[PDB]
Design a binder for this molecule. Structure first.
Ligand SMILES: *C(=O)[C@@H](NC(=O)/C(=N\O[C@@H](COc1ccc(C(=N)N[C@@H]2CCCNC2)cc1)C(=O)O)c1csc(N)n1)C(C)(C)NOS(=O)(=O)O
Ligand SMILES: [Cl-]
Ligand SMILES: [Cl-]
Length: 512
């Protein structure tokens, strides 16, 4: 039939390393040794089989069955992906017909801690989820090709000849700081356990560079062992899940009020009796023991009524404009697999009820990433630096989306939300002035179910990082009792890790 045969073999390309921003390995192509066999040669050395089988960790008779059943094939795999050292002891047995191929297997040194961001490759070493998928072309490289001239009995007579070399993939350095990532991962997980919550997300970003410094979710999974992996655990919820932001968008409503020319911080709004009726609907505050609140007090008490009255006065168009311009419900440009854009509703003419509900964050849907980016722009004196999941060496120009004077005023109000009497004191960061806003969003007709939110930034004197904590369905639940302490603990550790000077460790009690 055939005197010879020409078999073609690909030379595997070394897949690009993924590191965090400091060069810590997050995805590594590690060398592995695959053993294959020519059964026609192996069948001439049967008395070596029990020793070979032992070296492979395989049952003597099952190994023998496998060879005998494939006795005519010129090629079977004995085992793929042993360690180089395990392969080295088998090669030393010098069994006829047993040969080795070096290939690579992806290893994820941080495991579940950064699994949602990094993703993973399939058995064919192709990116399937996360960054591995999004940057697959960058990471993959260009494999080579060999030619093997084989026998009529499958024995490779002519030594392989290399057609094309293997071109390695490119290194990729993420924006993530693995130190902050571990801190965020451990504090979110502990908070979930303490609160009996179903899921959660935590985003940390650099307000000055747009970099995503940490992005963790629960549940998570071990990418190095995906046996019994369930779909819910795979979700990078910070990017691919949407939620109503509720009270956490009130600083943007307040930004529109101050940009309107119609409102100044010392203005007061009468929110008594803690409710406001619009047709058949009643807007309700949680704490309903207030009458006059100034604009800062409306944020401290989180008065839906107060922000609603302001929204009626200034018009929803101005609030829509700020929310759109800080990115809520807008494409982020990151291109993360499955990333959601959410929804910021718009109208030619805004009905009165929807003007109020926009202003306190009902009925729009955002991602944790978007909410964090919005807070980063506010923290950065109103200038939005573009998002990045990769290390930023040369920072692109930002876009001024809130005037610096309005941004600075709203920043001070959010510092009061954390530090003033009656505010979110469990969000305070010891040694630092922190600023932010809690939220609690009921999942309407979705039976005693809520999300607890906190969004903020620090240090208030020169903001460095913005943070969003989302805790999904705690079993207690308020934003200020559930997500606020997580913000405090993670913000304190992250500021320390970044060597940020404390701006609230005075040694003297000053007066005023
Ligand atoms: C802002 O986010 C805003 N939230 C809402 O109006 C929305 N839902 O509100 C839910 C009620 O939320 C709370 C109730 C009670 C408390 C609280 N501190 N008191 C106790 C805590 C322990 C349990 N017993 C009560 C805190 C929050 C609701 O209506 O069920 C909302 C907006 S969009 C959407 N889908 N839902 C409020 C709650 C006014 N401010 O939020 S904040 O986090 O408290 O600052
Ligand atoms: Cl609190
Ligand atoms: Cl509601």
């Amino acid at each position: 039939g055939d005197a010879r045969s020409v078999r073609h073999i690909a030379i595997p390309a070394h897949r690009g390393l993924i590191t965090d921003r400091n060069g810590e390995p997050l995805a590594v192509s590690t060398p592995v040794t695959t053993l294959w066999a020519n059964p026609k040669e192996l069948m001439t050395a049967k008395e070596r089989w029990p020793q070979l089988a032992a070296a492979l960790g395989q049952d003597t008779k099952l190994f023998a069955d496998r060879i005998e059943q494939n006795a005519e094939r010129e090629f079977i795999y004995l085992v793929r992906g042993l360690t180089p050292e395990q392969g080295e002891g088998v090669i030393a047995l010098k069994v006829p017909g047993v040969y080795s191929i070096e290939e690579f297997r992806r290893f994820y040194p941080a495991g579940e801690v950064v699994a949602h961001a990094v993703g993973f490759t399939d058995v064919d070493d192709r990116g399937r989820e996360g960054i591995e998928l999004a940057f697959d072309e960058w990471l993959a490289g260009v494999p080579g090709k060999r030619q093997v001239l084989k026998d009529r009995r499958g024995r490779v007579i002519k030594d392989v000849q290399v057609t094309k070399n293997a071109k390695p993939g490119k290194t990729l350095a993420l924006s993530i700081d693995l130190r902050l990532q571990y801190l965020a991962h451990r504090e979110l997980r502990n908070a979930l356990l303490e609160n009996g919550a179903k899921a959660g997300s935590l985003v940390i970003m650099d307000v000055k560079t747009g970099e995503i410094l940490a992005m963790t979710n629960q549940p998570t999974y071990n990418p190095n062992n995906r046996r019994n992996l369930q779909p819910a655990a795979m979700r990078n919820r910070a990017m691919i899940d949407v939620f109503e932001p509720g009270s956490t968008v009130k600083p943007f409503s307040m930004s529109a009020a101050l940009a309107s020319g119609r409102w100044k911080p010392s203005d007061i709004v009468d929110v008594y009796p803690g409710t406001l009726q619009i047709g058949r609907y009643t807007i309700r505050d949680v704490s309903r023991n207030s009458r006059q609140l100034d604009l800062t007090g409306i944020l401290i008490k989180s008065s839906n009524v107060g922000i609603s009255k302001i929204a009626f006065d200034i018009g929803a168009e101005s609030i829509y404009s700020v929310m759109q311009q800080v990115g809520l419900g807008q494409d982020t440009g990151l291109g993360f697999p499955g990333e959601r854009v959410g929804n910021l509703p718009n109208h030619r003419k805004w009905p009165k009820a929807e003007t109020a509900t926009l202003a306190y964050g009902y009925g729009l849907s955002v991602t944790a990433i978007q909410l964090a980016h919005a807070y980063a722009a506010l923290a950065n004196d109103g200038k939005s630096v573009p998002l990045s999941m990769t290390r930023v060496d040369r920072v692109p120009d930002g876009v001024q989306v809130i005037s610096p004077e309005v941004a600075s005023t709203v920043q001070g109000m959010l510092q009061q939300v954390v530090e003033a009497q009656g505010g979110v004191f469990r969000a305070q960061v010891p040694g630092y002035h922190a600023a932010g806003k809690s939220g609690t969003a009921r999942k309407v007709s979705v039976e005693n179910a809520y999300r607890s939110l906190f969004a903020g930034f620090a240090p208030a004197t020169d903001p460095r990082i913005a943070m969003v904590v989302v805790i999904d369905e705690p079993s207690k639940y308020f934003g200020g009792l559930v997500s606020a302490p997580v913000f405090s603990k993670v913000m304190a550790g992250a500021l320390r890790l970044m060597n940020v000077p404390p701006d609230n460790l005075p040694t003297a009690k000053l007066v005023p």
